[PDB]
């Protein structure tokens, strides 16, 4: 079968240098050239280029040119992304792909996704967030959980270990310092708050640190 | 040299419903050499339509189109929750190789009004030197929406910081989070905090206000 | 030109039906029995060149026969 | 993937003396070895695959012209020169425009201008280098077991019996082994890069479709032509033209589309498909088939007790043999299906030759199809299928009696000798000796004379030769036949091969 | 040092050096190094008689680790012959053909 498996998500710095890996299956390795497709930042799927894998050439689109580079691995099946000179305008996911020539390809890479940011690793602020009385409205008394300045990702945010799922909602974090903050808000009926114990479980493993933080009436 | 652009960028459509995109190739004549990409966000996209007229391995026989030179059409006439996702089209013929900007899939619901709700800082955060005010805005569709932090009736856009999803995977819905960050200082030096959330549901904005005088 | 020089033929393995191949064996005879029928006049003269020289009777039809071909499109 | 129902159905007389035997296949042609010991094979190309393409270059047979531009100028002023020469995209060219005291000028009689038109592409072709290594083969291999109508002409159900096999032979691993199950093994040992000439030709892309080209020819075409990487092109001037220059007035108008003149340049080309891989229609390869592993099992199996019945009736396969299905609806099974060829009922004694070797009845589940095929002789013979009470017969005949056989040998022979090159010795395969010299004159042979004169097209090769002929007619005595060398055969032969 | 016992690999794809001979590239995935590297020029499978003669005499592994590129050339004869890297079913083997 047929399945292109490459280098997990990287955490990188400004300045630095990366050689991404696209290890492929389900066929010999030479006779498919590598298609580079970058994701930008705004979810534009920006083409990278293509190397001719025979021979071993890259063919580079011109804007990713003499930054980035195409090299190869034979015997095990592995093409290889590498990039000089890191910059933060390249935090993206980065793809590969087992070439059909002009009709472009069957099968996807995995995708790789580059982080390039100064900061300290380090664990989120997790505030258990006590709703007010304009916060109750229709029979439910809705709760959140503020995850704020945690690097890097992901963390898991459930609420009671995941026993309610319901009116939880996850949102994502974007930058701040390059540190994420995000909140989660789970919505349970005014029966069950604070009768019922509601607890924000967020798991960060990245930091080693499961924080639990039970919301309390005002 | 080809410049590409899919229309609607956004359609919301039920499902079973017909959905012809509009589209176009600049540079002329591509003969048939268009394609069509579905991407859901975080995820690399799937080959839809290759020849114009044929699917792929994988892609169901719900995909269709037609079209050569100029315009081009991705024609699914029994659109599907599964069938949520961004869409994009690629060109071959002349080099370099590049696509068009994309259209999203939106299950077409009732329009429904956000459940707004706006935290105080917690005494963790406000003991931290900081305070960040939470603004919660669950199940709301359209994805239409606009948030106004007013401190004492006066808006503040400086520390607003917006989070919201996508289309729900269970009801289909936007929801979405705003955050108003500030110094306790500056956060014990201003009353009233409230998040309006006006909506093409609510004709007028929702208002959610608490002060810190108020319990 | 594409007009001539054609890619006609392979003639590398190649046994199926080509492009064009039926219409290949009305390429040169047609369009030159054309240019005769066009050019009559010409072809009375023509093969009288054939029997002014040589008077070795058969290859002077050699001359003719062959020159005839080359006229049209010359 | 099997010989069944195939345009062109060719067959393998065994020898034995050898396991191993080098033979050559095309996608069209099926090849069908019968021999000792071994059962009735099928070999044949589906088609032949290649894997990465490279861009040699493109060709932009339709434009349009854009943005006139016409600089005019006195006479005596030498060159005239328009801004527009420096970037490549302007199509610029000098002339001239003949001046009066009443246009522009002081002078009369000549004059000086530079006209320039941004060049524009409506259309453009693609053309494709091969790699020898990315050149795949998809060979079905195919032996004859218990059959019927369906599973015959089924991959799957066979892969299930083990009987039949597909496979990828790349220069990288051009030796395959795969096995037949209870028949035993076989080894294949192809030859990928050496099958086609993977440099001696292109693929052009004209329109959608993509085509065959020689890329000798390729680079040959006049035509604007395209750079891999993006912009400057060369002779883009050939489709747009000039006209009179009438003041500062000169129209550049750009040719039609030249697509059909890209079908009117394609005369012999193959009609090429594709998706992810491109699959040839005609093929060329030279594998070697081993069958020492290959073997007879159950000939301990006896003959069966009961009545027979025919699935379908039987007709003949226009190749030289007679197939027939048969539904056994004895529940003796599983059991080795009597059957014969014979000349008179009469005569029990076995003629004609079982295509099929061994008919075996698969379980011994009654009305069981069995599809197995036989070789009857020339003549009135007759289809026996079963021994005592037990046999329902059928009458044949088959007009292709050995004399049209041995032309049909011989003429198709020259036949498998033309357009086969060198490679036509390897249908005389275990060769050495007479079959290693053979292809060895006709290598340098191959090597020179029709290849060096080659490229002739039809009646330009055939007419010659009837003149060529002549060179027979006027000789000398003990130099006779070396005016008449060339002359008869290698030369008229491919001109009556090919008619039409 | 004798024969290795294990798979190979082709770190680069064979060619022509244009000069005559051809040179391959090889991994070797194999523990059992430092040995000898087994290899052949050979006119058919069937014969397993060297014909064509190594550019470089006795190819040998540097190390024990695995998947080591070893670079050796060889010269095949004239005609259709066979690059064979390894004996017994361990054997990946090319096709080569020389019209000089």
């Known amino acids: 079968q047929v399945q292109l498996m490459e280098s997990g998500p990287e955490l990188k710095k400004p300045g630095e240098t990366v050689k991404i890996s696209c290890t492929t299956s389900?066929?010999?390795?030479?006779?498919?050239?590598m298609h580079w497709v970058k994701q930008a930042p705004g979810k534009g799927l920006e083409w990278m280029g293509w190397?001719?894998?025979?021979?071993?050439?890259?063919t580079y689109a011109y804007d990713f040119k003499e930054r980035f580079g195409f090299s190869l691995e034979t015997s095990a099946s592995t093409a290889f992304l590498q990039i000089s000179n890191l910059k933060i305008e390249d935090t993206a996911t980065y793809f590969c792909?087992?070439?059909?020539?002009?009709?472009?390809?069957?099968?996807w890479g995995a995708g790789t996704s580059v982080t390039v940011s100064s900061p300290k690793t380090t664990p989120p602020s997790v505030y258990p967030l006590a709703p007010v009385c304009g916060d109750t409205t229709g029979s439910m008394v809705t709760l959140g959980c503020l995850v704020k300045g945690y690097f890097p990702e992901p963390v898991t945010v459930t609420w009671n270990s995941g026993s309610l799922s319901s009116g939880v909602h996850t949102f994502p974090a974007v930058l701040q310092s390059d540190l994420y903050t995000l909140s989660s808000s789970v919505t349970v009926p005014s029966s069950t708050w604070p009768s019922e114990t509601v607890t924000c479980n967020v798991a960060h493993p990245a930091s080693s640190t499961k924080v639990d933080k039970k919301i309390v009436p005002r | 040299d080809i410049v590409l652009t899919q229309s609607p960028a956004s359609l919301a459509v039920s499902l079973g419903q017909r959905a012809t995109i509009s589209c176009r190739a600049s540079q002329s004549v591509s003969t048939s050499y268009m394609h069509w990409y579905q991407q859901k966000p975080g995820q690399p996209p799937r080959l839809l339509i290759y020849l114009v007229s044929n699917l792929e391995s994988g892609v169901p026989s719900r995909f269709s189109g037609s079209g050569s030179g100029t315009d081009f059409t991705l024609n699914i006439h029994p659109v599907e929750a599964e069938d949520e996702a961004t869409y994009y089209c690629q060109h071959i013929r002349e080099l370099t190789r590049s696509e068009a900007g994309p259209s999203w899939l939106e299950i077409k619901r009732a329009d429904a009004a956000p459940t707004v709700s706006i935290f105080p800082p917690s005494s963790e955060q406000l003991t931290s030197g900081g305070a960040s005010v939470v603004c919660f805005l669950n199940n709301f569709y359209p994805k239409d929406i606009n948030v106004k932090w007013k401190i004492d009736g006066s808006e503040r856009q400086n520390g607003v910081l917006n989070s919201w999803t996508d289309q729900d995977s269970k009801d289909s819905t936007y929801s979405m989070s705003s955050t108003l960050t500030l110094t306790k200082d500056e956060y014990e030096r201003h009353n009233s905090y409230t998040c309006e959330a006006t909506h093409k549901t609510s004709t007028s904005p929702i208002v959610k206000s608490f002060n810190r005088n108020e319990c | 030109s594409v007009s001539v020089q054609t890619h006609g033929e392979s003639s590398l393995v190649n046994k199926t039906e080509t492009w064009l191949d039926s219409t290949k064996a009305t390429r040169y005879l047609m369009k030159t029995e054309n240019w005769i029928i066009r050019n009559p006049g010409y072809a009375f003269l023509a093969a009288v060149l054939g029997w002014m020289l040589g008077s070795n009777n058969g290859q002077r039809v050699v001359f003719t026969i062959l020159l005839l071909l080359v006229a049209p499109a010359y | 993937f099997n010989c069944l129902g195939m345009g062109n159905r060719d067959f393998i007389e065994g020898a034995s003396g050898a396991t191993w035997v080098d033979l050559v296949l095309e996608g069209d042609s099926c090849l069908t070895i019968m021999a000792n010991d071994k059962p009735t094979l099928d070999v044949r190309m589906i088609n032949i695959e290649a894997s990465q393409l490279a861009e040699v270059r493109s060709y932009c047979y339709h434009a349009s012209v854009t943005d006139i531009s016409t600089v005019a100028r006195c006479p005596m002023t030498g060159e005239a020169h328009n801004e527009k020469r420096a970037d490549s995209s302007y199509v610029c060219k000098q002339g001239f425009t003949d001046r009066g005291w009443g246009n522009g000028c002081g002078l009369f009689g000549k004059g000086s201008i530079d006209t320039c038109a941004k060049f524009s592409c409506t259309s453009k072709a693609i053309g494709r280098t091969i790699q020898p290594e990315n050149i795949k083969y998809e060979v079905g291999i195919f032996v004859h077991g218990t059959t019927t109508s369906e599973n015959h002409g089924n991959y799957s159900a066979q892969v299930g019996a083990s009987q039949a096999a597909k496979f990828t032979v790349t220069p990288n691993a051009p030796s395959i082994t795969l096995k037949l199950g209870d028949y035993g093994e076989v080894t294949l040992d192809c030859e990928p890069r050496s099958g086609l000439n993977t440099e001696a030709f292109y693929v052009m892309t004209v329109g959608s479709k993509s085509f065959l080209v020689h890329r000798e020819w390729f680079h040959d075409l006049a035509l604007p032509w395209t750079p891999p990487s993006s912009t400057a092109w060369r002779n883009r001037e050939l489709l747009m033209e000039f006209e009179e220059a009438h003041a500062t007035k000169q129209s550049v108008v750009a040719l039609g589309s030249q697509e059909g003149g890209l079908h009117q340049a394609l005369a012999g080309a193959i009609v090429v498909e594709y998706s992810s891989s491109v699959k040839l229609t005609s093929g060329h390869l030279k594998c070697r088939l081993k069958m020492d592993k290959l073997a007879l099992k159950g000939t301990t199996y006896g003959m069966c007790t009961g009545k027979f019945s025919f699935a379908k009736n039987p007709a003949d396969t226009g190749h030289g043999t007679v197939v027939i299905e048969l539904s056994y609806s004895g529940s003796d099974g599983p059991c080795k299906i009597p059957i014969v060829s014979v000349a008179s009922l009469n005569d029990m004694t076995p003629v004609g030759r079982l295509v099929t070797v061994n008919p075996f009845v698969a379980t011994s589940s009654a009305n069981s199809k069995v599809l197995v095929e036989m070789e009857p002789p020339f003549g009135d013979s007759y289809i026996v299928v079963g021994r005592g009470d037990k046999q329902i017969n059928h009458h044949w005949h088959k007009a292709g009696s050995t004399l049209g056989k041995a032309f049909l040998t011989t003429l198709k022979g020259a036949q498998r000798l033309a357009a086969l090159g060198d490679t036509a010795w390897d249908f005389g395969s275990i060769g050495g000796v007479f079959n290693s010299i053979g292809k060895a004159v006709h290598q340098v042979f191959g090597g020179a004379f029709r290849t060096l004169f080659g490229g002739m097209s039809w009646i330009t090769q055939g007419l010659m030769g009837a003149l060529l002929l002549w060179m027979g007619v006027n000789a000398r005595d003990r130099s006779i036949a070396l005016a008449f060398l060339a002359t008869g055969g290698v030369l008229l032969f491919l001109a009556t091969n090919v008619h039409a | 040092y004798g024969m290795c016992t294990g798979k190979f690999s082709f770190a680069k794809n064979p060619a022509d050096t244009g000069h005559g001979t051809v040179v391959i590239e090889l991994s070797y995935s194999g523990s059992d190094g430092p040995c000898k590297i087994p290899i052949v020029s050979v006119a058919s499978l069937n014969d397993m008689t060297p014909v064509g003669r190594l550019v470089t005499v006795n190819p040998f592994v540097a190390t024990s680790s695995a998947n080591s590129k070893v670079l050796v050339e060889m010269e095949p004869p004239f005609g259709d012959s066979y690059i064979v890297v390894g004996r017994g079913d361990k054997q990946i083997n090319h096709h080569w053909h020389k019209a000089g």
């Open positions: 190397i001719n894998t025979a021979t071993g050439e890259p």
């Open positions: 792909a087992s070439d059909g020539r002009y009709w472009y390809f069957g099968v």
């Open positions: 389900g066929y010999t390795f030479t006779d498919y050239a």
